[PDB]
Each structure stands twice: as C-alpha cells, then as structure tokens.
Design a protein around this ligand. Structure first.
Ligand SMILES: [Cu+2]
Length: 124
C-alpha cells in the first residue's frame, strides 16, 4: 500500500515547514512517497537515528523521493533546510522496535517539539 507525505510551507492549522502527515504508520512492503507539494523542500534520513543497516533515503531538493518500508521499526526523516524549523517526520513500519533509541535522540528546539509530538503517536 502507498502512503503520501506532502512537503508543505504551511498546513491549514498554521504550522510552518511541515511534513503532512508528520507521523505515518505503514506495513512492510509499503512505500512512502514524499511529494514536493510546495517547492524548496526535501526528505532525507536523519542518519544519526536511522535504523542500523537499512539503506538511507536522500531526496533531491524540490523532488519526490520514496522510502521503501521493509524492516520493522521507526524511521525519522528531515527536510535539510528546514529541520531546525521543525520539518521532521516519523514513519513507523510495523512494530516500533527501536522506540527507546528514537526517544534517546537529542533533537532541539522546533524539531524536538515536532518529533516529540510524532513519537507520541507511535502505535504500540
Ligand atoms: Cu522543508
């Protein structure tokens, strides 16, 4: 099953530099497509927290990119120019096996706020 995450300058609630949705639950074999609804964004792995051994994602600037969900766990992506403004997304593939490690990751500021909100949506 395919899931879409839009790259947006603003959502309708007023939040700026957002992935919409900011949390998505998927199953192995699903794809997650990050689409440039607004230009000047990307989606790429936060490599410092990306699951061990799983191929990273690095989309081009203003381009669509896919995450091929395969191994169970939690996957954090950022928008490179807007990470500090909070533009972060959390994809859960199946069981959230690495939840402790995602909670241990030190984000700050707006990424911390937004990632914490996303972590709270994890399905256990
Ligand atoms: Cu962005």
């Amino acid at each position: 099953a395919e899931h879409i995450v839009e790259m947006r300058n603003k959502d309708d609630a007023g939040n700026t530099m957002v992935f919409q949705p900011g949390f998505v639950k998927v199953e192995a074999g699903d794809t997650v497509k990050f689409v440039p609804t607004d230009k000047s964004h990307n989606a790429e792995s936060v490599r410092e927290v990306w699951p061990e051994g799983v191929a990273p994602v690095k989309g081009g600037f203003s381009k669509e990119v896919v995450f091929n969900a395969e191994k169970e766990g939690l996957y954090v992506l950022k928008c490179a120019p807007h990470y500090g403004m909070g533009m972060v997304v959390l994809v859960q593939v199946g069981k959230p096996v690495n939840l402790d490690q995602i909670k241990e990751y030190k984000a700050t500021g707006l990424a911390k706020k937004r990632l914490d909100g996303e972590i709270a949506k994890v399905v256990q």
